[PDB]
Short mmCIF file of C-alpha atoms and ligand atoms in Angstrom, two decimals:
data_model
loop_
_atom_site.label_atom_id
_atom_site.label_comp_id
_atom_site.label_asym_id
_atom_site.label_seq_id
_atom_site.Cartn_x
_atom_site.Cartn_y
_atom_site.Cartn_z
CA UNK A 1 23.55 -9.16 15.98
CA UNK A 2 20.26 -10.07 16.33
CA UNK A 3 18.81 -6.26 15.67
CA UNK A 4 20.73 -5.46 12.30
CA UNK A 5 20.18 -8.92 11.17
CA UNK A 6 16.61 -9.16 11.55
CA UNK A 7 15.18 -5.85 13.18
CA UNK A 8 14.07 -7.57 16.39
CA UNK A 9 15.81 -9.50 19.38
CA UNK A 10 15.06 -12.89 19.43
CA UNK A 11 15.93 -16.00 21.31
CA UNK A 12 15.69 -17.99 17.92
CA UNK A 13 18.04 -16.61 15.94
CA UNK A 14 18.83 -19.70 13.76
CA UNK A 15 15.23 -20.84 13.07
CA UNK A 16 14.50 -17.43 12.21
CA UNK A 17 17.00 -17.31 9.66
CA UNK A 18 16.07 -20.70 8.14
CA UNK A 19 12.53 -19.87 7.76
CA UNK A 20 13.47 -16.80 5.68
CA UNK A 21 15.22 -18.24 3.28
CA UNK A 22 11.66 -18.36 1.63
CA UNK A 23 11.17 -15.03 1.94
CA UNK A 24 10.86 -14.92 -1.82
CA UNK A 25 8.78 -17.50 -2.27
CA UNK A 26 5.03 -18.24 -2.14
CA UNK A 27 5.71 -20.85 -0.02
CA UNK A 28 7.24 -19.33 3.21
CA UNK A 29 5.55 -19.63 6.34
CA UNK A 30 4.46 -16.29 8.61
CA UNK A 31 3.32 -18.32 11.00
CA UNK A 32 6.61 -19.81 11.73
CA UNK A 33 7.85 -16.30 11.65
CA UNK A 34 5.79 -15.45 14.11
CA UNK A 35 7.18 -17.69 16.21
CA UNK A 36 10.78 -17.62 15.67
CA UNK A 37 10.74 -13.84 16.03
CA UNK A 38 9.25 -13.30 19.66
CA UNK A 39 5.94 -12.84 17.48
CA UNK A 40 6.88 -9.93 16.13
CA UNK A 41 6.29 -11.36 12.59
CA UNK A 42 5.47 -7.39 11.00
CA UNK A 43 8.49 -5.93 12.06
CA UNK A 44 10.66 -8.52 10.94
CA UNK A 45 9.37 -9.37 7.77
CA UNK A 46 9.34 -5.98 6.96
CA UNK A 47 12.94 -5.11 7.71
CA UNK A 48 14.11 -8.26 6.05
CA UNK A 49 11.97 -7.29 2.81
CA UNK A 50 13.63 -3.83 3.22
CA UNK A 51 17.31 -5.17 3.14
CA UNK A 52 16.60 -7.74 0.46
CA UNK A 53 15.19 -4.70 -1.52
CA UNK A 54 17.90 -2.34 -0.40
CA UNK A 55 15.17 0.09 0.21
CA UNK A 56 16.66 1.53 3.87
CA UNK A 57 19.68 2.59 1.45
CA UNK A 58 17.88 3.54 -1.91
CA UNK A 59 15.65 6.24 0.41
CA UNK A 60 17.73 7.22 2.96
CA UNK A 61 15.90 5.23 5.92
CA UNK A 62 17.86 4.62 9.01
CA UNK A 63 17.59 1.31 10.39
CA UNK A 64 16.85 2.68 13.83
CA UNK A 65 13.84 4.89 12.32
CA UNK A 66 12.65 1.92 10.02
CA UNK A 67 12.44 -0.50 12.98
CA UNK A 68 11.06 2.06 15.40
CA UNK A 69 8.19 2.63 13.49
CA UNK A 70 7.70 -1.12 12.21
CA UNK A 71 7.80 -1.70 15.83
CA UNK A 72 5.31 1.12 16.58
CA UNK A 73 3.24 -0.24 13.68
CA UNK A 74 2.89 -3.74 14.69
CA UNK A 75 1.25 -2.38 17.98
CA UNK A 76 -1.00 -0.83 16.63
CA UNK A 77 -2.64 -3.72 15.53
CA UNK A 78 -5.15 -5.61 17.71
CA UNK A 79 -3.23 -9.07 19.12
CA UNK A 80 -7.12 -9.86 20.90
CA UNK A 81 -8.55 -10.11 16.96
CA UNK A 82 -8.32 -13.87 15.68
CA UNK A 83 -7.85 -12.71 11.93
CA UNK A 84 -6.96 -8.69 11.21
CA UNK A 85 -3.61 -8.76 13.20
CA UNK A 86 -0.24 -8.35 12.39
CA UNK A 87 0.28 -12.00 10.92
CA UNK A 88 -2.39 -11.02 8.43
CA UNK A 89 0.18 -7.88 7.96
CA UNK A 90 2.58 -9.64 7.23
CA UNK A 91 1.57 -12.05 5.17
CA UNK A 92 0.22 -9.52 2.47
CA UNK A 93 3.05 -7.54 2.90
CA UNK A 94 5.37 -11.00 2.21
CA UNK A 95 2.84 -11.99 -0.65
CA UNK A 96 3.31 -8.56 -2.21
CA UNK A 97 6.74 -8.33 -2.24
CA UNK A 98 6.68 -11.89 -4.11
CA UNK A 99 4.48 -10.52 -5.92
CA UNK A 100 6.16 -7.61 -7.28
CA UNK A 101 9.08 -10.22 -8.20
CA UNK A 102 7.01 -12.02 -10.70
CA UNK A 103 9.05 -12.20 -14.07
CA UNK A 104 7.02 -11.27 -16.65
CA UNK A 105 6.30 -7.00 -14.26
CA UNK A 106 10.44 -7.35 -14.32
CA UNK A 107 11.58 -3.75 -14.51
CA UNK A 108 8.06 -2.76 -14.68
CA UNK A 109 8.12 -1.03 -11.74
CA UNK A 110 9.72 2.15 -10.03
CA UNK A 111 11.79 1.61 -6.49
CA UNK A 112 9.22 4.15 -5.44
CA UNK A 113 6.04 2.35 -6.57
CA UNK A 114 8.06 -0.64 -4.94
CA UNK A 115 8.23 1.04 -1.56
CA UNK A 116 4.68 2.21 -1.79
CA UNK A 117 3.03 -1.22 -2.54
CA UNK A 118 5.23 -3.18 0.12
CA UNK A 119 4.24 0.16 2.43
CA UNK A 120 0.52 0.10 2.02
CA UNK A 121 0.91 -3.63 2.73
CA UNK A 122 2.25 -3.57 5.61
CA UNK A 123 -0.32 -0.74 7.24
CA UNK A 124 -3.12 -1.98 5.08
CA UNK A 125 -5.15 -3.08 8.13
CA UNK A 126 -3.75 -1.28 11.39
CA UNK A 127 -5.80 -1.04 14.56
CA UNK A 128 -8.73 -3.17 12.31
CA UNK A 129 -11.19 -3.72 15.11
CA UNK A 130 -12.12 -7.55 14.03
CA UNK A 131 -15.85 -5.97 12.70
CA UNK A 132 -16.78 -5.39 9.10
CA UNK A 133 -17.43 -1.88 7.56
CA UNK A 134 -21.34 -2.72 7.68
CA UNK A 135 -21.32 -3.11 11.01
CA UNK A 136 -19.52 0.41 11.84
CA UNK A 137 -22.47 1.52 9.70
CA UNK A 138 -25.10 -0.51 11.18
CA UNK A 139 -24.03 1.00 14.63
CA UNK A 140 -24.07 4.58 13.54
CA UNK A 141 -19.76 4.43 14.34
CA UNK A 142 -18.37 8.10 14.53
CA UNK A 143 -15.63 6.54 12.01
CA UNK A 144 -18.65 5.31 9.33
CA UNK A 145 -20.15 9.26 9.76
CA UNK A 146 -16.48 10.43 9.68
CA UNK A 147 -15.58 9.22 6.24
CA UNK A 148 -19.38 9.30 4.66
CA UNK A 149 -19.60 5.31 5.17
CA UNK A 150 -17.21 4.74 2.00
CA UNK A 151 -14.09 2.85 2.66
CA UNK A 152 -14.50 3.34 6.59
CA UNK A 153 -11.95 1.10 7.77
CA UNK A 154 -9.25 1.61 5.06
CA UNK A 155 -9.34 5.18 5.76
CA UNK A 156 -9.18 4.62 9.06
CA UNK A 157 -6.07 2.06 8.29
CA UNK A 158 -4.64 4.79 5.67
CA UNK A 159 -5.26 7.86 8.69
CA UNK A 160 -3.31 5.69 11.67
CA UNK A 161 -0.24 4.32 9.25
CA UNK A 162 0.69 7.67 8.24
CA UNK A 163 0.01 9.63 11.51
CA UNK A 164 2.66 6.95 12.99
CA UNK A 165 5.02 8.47 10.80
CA UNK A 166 4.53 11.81 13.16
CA UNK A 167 5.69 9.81 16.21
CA UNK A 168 9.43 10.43 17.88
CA UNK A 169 11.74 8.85 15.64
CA UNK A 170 9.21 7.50 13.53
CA UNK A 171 9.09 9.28 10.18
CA UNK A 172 10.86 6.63 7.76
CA UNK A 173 10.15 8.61 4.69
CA UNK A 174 11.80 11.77 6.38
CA UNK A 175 14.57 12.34 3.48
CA UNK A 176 11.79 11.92 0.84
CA UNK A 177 11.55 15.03 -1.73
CA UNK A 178 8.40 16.96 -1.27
CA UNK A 179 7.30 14.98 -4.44
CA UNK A 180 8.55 11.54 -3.54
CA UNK A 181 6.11 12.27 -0.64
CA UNK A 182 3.52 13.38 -2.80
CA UNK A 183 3.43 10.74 -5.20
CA UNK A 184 3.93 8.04 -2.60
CA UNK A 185 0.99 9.14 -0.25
CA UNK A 186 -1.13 9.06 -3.53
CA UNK A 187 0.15 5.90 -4.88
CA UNK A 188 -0.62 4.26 -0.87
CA UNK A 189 -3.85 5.74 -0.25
CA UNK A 190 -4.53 4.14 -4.03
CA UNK A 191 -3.39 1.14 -2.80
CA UNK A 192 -4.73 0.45 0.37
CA UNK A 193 -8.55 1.74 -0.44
CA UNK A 194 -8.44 -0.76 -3.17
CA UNK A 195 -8.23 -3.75 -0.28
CA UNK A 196 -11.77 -2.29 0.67
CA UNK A 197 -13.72 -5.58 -0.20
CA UNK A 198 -16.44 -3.27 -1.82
CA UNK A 199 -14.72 -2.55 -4.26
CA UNK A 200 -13.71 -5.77 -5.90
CA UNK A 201 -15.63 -5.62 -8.74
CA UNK A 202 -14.30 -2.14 -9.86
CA UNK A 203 -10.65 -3.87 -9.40
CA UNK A 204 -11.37 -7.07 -11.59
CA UNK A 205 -12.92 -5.07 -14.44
CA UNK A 206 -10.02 -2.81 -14.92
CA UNK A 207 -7.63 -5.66 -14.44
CA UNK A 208 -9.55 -7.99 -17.28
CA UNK A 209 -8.73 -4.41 -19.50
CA UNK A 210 -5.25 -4.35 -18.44
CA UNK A 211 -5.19 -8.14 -19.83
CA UNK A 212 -7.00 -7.59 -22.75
CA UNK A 213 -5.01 -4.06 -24.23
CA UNK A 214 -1.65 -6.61 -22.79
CA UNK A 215 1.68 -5.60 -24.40
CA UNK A 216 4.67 -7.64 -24.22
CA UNK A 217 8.26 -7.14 -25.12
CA UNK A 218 11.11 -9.85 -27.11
CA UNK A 219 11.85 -10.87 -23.45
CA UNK A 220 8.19 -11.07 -22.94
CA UNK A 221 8.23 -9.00 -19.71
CA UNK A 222 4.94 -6.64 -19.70
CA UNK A 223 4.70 -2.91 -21.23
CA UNK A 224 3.37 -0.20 -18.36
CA UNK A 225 5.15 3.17 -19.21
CA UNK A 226 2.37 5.09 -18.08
CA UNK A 227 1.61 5.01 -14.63
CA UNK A 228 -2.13 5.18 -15.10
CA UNK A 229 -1.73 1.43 -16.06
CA UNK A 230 0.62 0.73 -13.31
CA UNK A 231 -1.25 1.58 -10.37
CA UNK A 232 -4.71 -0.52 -11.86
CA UNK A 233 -2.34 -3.14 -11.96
CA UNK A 234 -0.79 -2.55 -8.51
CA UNK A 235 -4.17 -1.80 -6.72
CA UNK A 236 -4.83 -5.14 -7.97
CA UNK A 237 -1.61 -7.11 -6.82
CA UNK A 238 -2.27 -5.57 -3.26
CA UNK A 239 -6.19 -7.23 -3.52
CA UNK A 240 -4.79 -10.21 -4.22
CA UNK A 241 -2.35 -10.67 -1.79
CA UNK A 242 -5.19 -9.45 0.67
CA UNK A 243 -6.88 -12.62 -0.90
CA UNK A 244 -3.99 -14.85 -1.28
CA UNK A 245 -4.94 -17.71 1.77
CA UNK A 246 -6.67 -19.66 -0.48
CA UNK A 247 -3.38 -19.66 -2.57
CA UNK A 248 -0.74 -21.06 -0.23
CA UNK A 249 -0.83 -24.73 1.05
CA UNK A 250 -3.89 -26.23 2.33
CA UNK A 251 -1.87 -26.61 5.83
CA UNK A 252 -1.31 -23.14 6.10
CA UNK A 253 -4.66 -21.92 4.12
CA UNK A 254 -6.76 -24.32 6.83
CA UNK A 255 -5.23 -21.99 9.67
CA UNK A 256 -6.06 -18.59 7.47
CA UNK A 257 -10.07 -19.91 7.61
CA UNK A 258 -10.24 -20.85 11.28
CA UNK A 259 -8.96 -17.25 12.23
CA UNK A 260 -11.47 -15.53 10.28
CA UNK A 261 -14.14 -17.37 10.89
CA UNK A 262 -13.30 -16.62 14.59
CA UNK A 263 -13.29 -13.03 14.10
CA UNK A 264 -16.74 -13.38 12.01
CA UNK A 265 -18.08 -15.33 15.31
CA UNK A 266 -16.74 -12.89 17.53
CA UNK A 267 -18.81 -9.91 15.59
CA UNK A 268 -21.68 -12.51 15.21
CA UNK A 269 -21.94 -12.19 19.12
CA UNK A 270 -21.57 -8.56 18.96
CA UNK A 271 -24.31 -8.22 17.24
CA UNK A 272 -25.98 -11.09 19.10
CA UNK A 273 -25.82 -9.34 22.35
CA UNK A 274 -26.85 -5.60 20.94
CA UNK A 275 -29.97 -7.45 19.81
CA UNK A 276 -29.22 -7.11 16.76
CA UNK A 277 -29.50 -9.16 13.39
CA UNK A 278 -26.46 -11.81 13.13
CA UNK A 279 -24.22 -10.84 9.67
CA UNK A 280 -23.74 -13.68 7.08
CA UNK A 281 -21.12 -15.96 7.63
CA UNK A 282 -21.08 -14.36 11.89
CA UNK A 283 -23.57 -16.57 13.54
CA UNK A 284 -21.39 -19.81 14.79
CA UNK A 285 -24.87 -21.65 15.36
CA UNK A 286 -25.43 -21.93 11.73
CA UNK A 287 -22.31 -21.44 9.53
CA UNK A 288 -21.00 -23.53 6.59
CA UNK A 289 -16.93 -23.30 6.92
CA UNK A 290 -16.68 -25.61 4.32
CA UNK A 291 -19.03 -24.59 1.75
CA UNK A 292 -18.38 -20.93 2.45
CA UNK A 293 -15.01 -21.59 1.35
CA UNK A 294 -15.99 -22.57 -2.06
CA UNK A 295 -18.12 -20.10 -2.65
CA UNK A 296 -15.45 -17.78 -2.02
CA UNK A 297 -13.18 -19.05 -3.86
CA UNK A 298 -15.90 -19.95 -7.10
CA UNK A 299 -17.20 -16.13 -6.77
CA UNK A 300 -14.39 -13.94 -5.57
CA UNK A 301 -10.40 -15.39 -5.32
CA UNK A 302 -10.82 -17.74 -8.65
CA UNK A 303 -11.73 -15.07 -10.71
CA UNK A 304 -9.63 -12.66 -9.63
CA UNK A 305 -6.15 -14.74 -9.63
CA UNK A 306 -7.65 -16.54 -13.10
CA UNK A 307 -7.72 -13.13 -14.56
CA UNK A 308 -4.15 -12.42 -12.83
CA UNK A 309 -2.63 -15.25 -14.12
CA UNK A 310 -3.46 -14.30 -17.12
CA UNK A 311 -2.12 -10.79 -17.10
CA UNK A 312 1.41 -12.62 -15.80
CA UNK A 313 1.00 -15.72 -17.84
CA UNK A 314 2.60 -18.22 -17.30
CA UNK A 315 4.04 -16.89 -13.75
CA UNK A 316 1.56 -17.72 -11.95
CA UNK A 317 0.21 -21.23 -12.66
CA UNK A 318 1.00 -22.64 -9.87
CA UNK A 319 -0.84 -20.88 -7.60
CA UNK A 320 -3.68 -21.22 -9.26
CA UNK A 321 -3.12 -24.87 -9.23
CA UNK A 322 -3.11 -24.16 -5.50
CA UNK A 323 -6.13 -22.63 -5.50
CA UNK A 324 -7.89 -25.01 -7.66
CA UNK A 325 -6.94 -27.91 -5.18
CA UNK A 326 -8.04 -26.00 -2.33
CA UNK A 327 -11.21 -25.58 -3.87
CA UNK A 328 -11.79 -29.09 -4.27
CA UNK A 329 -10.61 -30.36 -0.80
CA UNK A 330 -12.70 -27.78 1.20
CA UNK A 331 -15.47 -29.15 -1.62
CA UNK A 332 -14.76 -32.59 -0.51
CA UNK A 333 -15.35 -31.66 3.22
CA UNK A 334 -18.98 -30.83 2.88
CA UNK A 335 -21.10 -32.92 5.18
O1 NPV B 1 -14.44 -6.91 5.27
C1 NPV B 1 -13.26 -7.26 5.08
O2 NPV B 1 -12.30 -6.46 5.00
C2 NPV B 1 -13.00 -8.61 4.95
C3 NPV B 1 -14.06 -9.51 4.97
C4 NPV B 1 -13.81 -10.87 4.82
C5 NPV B 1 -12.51 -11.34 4.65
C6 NPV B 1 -12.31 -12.70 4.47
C7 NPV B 1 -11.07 -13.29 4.64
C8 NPV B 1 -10.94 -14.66 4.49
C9 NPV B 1 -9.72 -15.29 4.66
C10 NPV B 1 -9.65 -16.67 4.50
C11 NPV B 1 -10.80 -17.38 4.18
N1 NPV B 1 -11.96 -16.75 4.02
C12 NPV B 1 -12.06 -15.43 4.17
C13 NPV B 1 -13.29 -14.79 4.00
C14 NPV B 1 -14.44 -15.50 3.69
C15 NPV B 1 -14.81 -16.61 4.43
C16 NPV B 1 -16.01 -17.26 4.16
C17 NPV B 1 -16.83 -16.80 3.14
C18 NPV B 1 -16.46 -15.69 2.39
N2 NPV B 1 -17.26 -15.23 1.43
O3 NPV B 1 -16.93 -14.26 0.78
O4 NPV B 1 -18.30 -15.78 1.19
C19 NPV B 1 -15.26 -15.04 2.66
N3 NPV B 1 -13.37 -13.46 4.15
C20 NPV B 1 -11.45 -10.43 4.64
C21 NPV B 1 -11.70 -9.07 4.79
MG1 MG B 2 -8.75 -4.71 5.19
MG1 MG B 3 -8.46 -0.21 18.20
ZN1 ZN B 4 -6.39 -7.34 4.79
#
């Protein structure tokens, strides 16, 4: 059945279950998943994570809860927002979960920490109105006062995933110990206010530490006993599947850039009509795709996945192949 197979009903049952075969790989596309799943791409690449994981059984999570809430979830995130919707969900959740397969973090880390990361993924950007942090601030939002204009959205993405839990049939983490809860809320809200874009920086310079103290074993997998090393390194894995478009192929990279820049247009004319000053990179009448794109990827995604590939050497070479290439081409389309 279409339900237990895939945790939603769709018309498109065999393409659906061609396209995730890649679900472990870099290279699968959400897009298609989107589209082969009634576009419903959250829910089901988060129950088909889930089962390749065995996570429903592992925690004690129903398949009936799990999908309610994934459902729930999903609509919670705005469909009328080019960029921050539940594709973008999905694909970091997807990216993670490769992620967290890399070889050389094998047995690194806990089923827990596992759940978490793929978790704070998935609710990472709920109900994101398609307008940056400065702007709540620039507009004097109740939601920039709220949380003292640090991390506004991604407490606001943190408060609305975990209140869902609250809803009828919702609460997937419901046979959780008191400190499987504990920890997991901790290691999530870790998690997802590390995809606040602020605080990039902060992320890269622990990660170049985590490369430079790097321990390996015979089999040459990494050494993390203590968790204060794990979750620098998982705050960081999260960051960079937030910033993972520039990774994947050009084809579907090419699609990433023309939904955001439509969301940074749509804010530009925000702003535009409140008579006030048009954000960098928002006003349509003057933006550089093209060499925006490189110096995104020269200032911000380069060295961040340079500095992960080195932590997972030699893992993840091909990606920042990827990368590299992408860089060029977008370089090579500068009128
Ligand atoms: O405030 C946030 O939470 C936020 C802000 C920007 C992006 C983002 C995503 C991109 C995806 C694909 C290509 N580009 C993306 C860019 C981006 C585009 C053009 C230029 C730059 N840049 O940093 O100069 C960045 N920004 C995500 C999240
Ligand atoms: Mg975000
Ligand atoms: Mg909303
Ligand atoms: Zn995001």
């Amino acid at each position: 059945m279409s339900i237990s197979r895939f945790g939603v009903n769709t018309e498109n049952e065999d393409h659906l279950a061609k396209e995730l075969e890649d679900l472990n790989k870099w290279g699968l596309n959400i897009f298609n998943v989107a589209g082969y799943s009634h576009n419903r791409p959250l829910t089901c690449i988060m129950y088909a994570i889930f089962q390749e994981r065995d996570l429903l059984k592992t925690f004690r999570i129903s398949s009936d809860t799990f999908i309610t809430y994934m459902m729930t979830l999903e609509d919670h995130y705005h469909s009328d927002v080019a960029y921050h919707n539940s594709l973008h969900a999905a694909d970091v959740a997807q990216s993670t979960h490769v992620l967290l397969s890399t070889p050389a973090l094998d047995a690194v880390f806990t089923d827990l920490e596992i759940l978490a990361a793929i978790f704070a993924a998935a609710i990472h950007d709920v109900d994101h109105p398609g307008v940056s942090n400065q702007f709540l601030i620039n507009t004097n939002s109740e939601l920039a006062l709220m949380y003292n204009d640090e991390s506004v959205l991604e407490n606001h993405h943190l408060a609305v995933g975990f209140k869902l839990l609250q809803e009828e049939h919702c609460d997937i983490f419901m046979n959780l110990t008191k400190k499987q809860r504990q920890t997991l809320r901790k290691m999530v809200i870790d998690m997802v206010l590390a995809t606040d874009m602020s605080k990039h920086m902060s992320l890269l310079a622990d990660l170049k530490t985590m490369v430079e103290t790097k321990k390996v074993t015979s089999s040459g997998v990494l050494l993390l006993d203590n968790y204060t090393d794990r979750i620098q390194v998982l705050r960081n894995m999260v960051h960079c599947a937030d910033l993972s478009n520039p990774t994947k192929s050009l084809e579907l990279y090419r699609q990433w850039t023309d939904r955001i820049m439509e969301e940074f247009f749509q804010q530009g004319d925000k702003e535009r009509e409140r008579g006030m000053e048009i954000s960098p990179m928002c006003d349509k009448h003057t933006a550089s795709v093209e060499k925006s794109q490189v110096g995104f990827i020269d200032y911000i995604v380069h060295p961040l996945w340079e500095t992960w590939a080195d932590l997972v050497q030699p893992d993840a070479q091909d990606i920042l192949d990827t990368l590299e290439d992408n860089r060029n081409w977008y370089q090579s389309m500068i009128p």
